[PDB]
Amino acid sequence: HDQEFDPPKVYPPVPAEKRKPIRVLSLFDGIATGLLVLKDLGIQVDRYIASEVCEDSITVGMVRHQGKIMYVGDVRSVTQKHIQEWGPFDLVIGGSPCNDLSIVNPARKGLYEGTGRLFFEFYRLLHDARPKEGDDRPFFWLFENVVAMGVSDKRDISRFLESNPVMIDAKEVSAAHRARYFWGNLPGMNRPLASTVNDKLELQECLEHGRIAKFSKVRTDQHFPVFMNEKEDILWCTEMERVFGFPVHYTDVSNMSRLARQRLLGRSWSVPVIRHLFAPLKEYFACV
DNA sequence: CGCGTACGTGCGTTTAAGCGGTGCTAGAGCTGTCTACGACCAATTGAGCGGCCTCGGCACCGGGATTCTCCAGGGCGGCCGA
Ligand SMILES: Nc1ncnc2c1ncn2[C@@H]1O[C@H](CSCC[C@H](N)C(=O)O)[C@@H](O)[C@H]1O
Fold it and tell me: Does ligand 1 lie within 6 Å of residue A33's CB atom?
């Protein structure tokens, strides 16, 4: 599909003597997957600012990052003054809530409802955190969304962000079936999925003991995908974290139920997919 | 109103009820003898019943513990549908 045409801006590599840690703005953070991947790659983080509403996700971040995260409330409360007073950013990330962007809803409300239009909030903060002309600072940005969108919606998003959406499927690097569009200007945006041997490709490596995988991988019949003691059992939450690439026992931070952990892990990013995406940032920024 | 199961019908098979015989004998049934067991009569007396009394066991008011009843809330999926 060639509807628009624009070259991706490739920044020159900075040497090690002018190497600086990253300043990261994370708009729709949720479960703090971005800072988790950044800490796993061994990258020094000078400032991480997450604008999260949901208190369970804020609790996930406060437990798993120990007060490193600077919290904002709603993204509508962020102005241009808040962007220009919190220093210039080096990495902007986010994925808008796809309640009305997904075409799996028969009665979907579209891009221009209060769940979808938050994307434009992103664009506004994309417009504020972007450096002006004449500044050769390497500025990188990343937007995530689902594959189940309309043609006009994806076309308008691609025109607004001015980048080619690469499609990445979790089955090439992890044990999940979800294809996601990624807008951004990272180097090697469409390079193939370098599967890490430490990543759990099959489903059975993500299971616990005493459980047999019925399928080869899981999706995002009135049965259950795991047999347990010759009985079909629901897929566990820690096993869901191992499928989604998270560390073991990650989203157990408060007194939330099983349904809350499902709602948090469903909306979260895939750790291996991000690790692939954030990989070339290591040569552009600080290392630890 | 739907599921099923288990009962009724029919046919073949066969077990034994019924009828017809006789032989025998334990026992129902009738007869004579008498004896011992109960009705009938009087005296007597002591046990049982009318009357009384007093008192303690039962009925009853009140209070607290308790003991079951029931509904409100908190968490919990869960179920969608707008
Ligand atoms: N107006 C808003 N501003 C900021 N966050 C919001 C928001 N509305 C909802 N959110 C929260 O932000 C998250 C966006 S949903 C997708 C999250 C993202 N893909 C991830 O990496 O986890 C949701 O968890 C939702 O609870």
Answer: yes
Q: Mind telling me the catalytic residues of A?
A: 98
A264 φ/ψ angles, rounded to the nearest 5 degrees: -75, -45
State the number of CA atoms in the 13 A half-sphere of A82 facing the CB. 17
Query: Strands A140-146, A91-95: parallel, antiparallel or unpaired by DSSP?
Result: parallel
Which H/E stretch holds residue A26?
strand A22-26
Cβ contact A35:A69 at 8 Å = yes
The alpha carbon of A122 is separated from its chain's Cα centroid by a whole number of angstroms, namely 14
Distance from CA(A51) to C1'(B29), angstroms, rounded: 122
Alpha-helical segments (H) within A15-101 = 33-40, 55-65, 80-85
**Runs of H (alpha helix) within chain A:** 33-40, 55-65, 80-85, 118-129, 151-161, 237-243, 258-267, 271-278
Tell me the CA distances in angstroms from A76 to A66, A150, A172, A240, one per residue in order: 26, 26, 36, 32
Structure token digits, residue A178 = 């979800």
Q: Would you say A279 and A42 are in contact if contact means Cβ atoms under 8 Å apart?
A: no
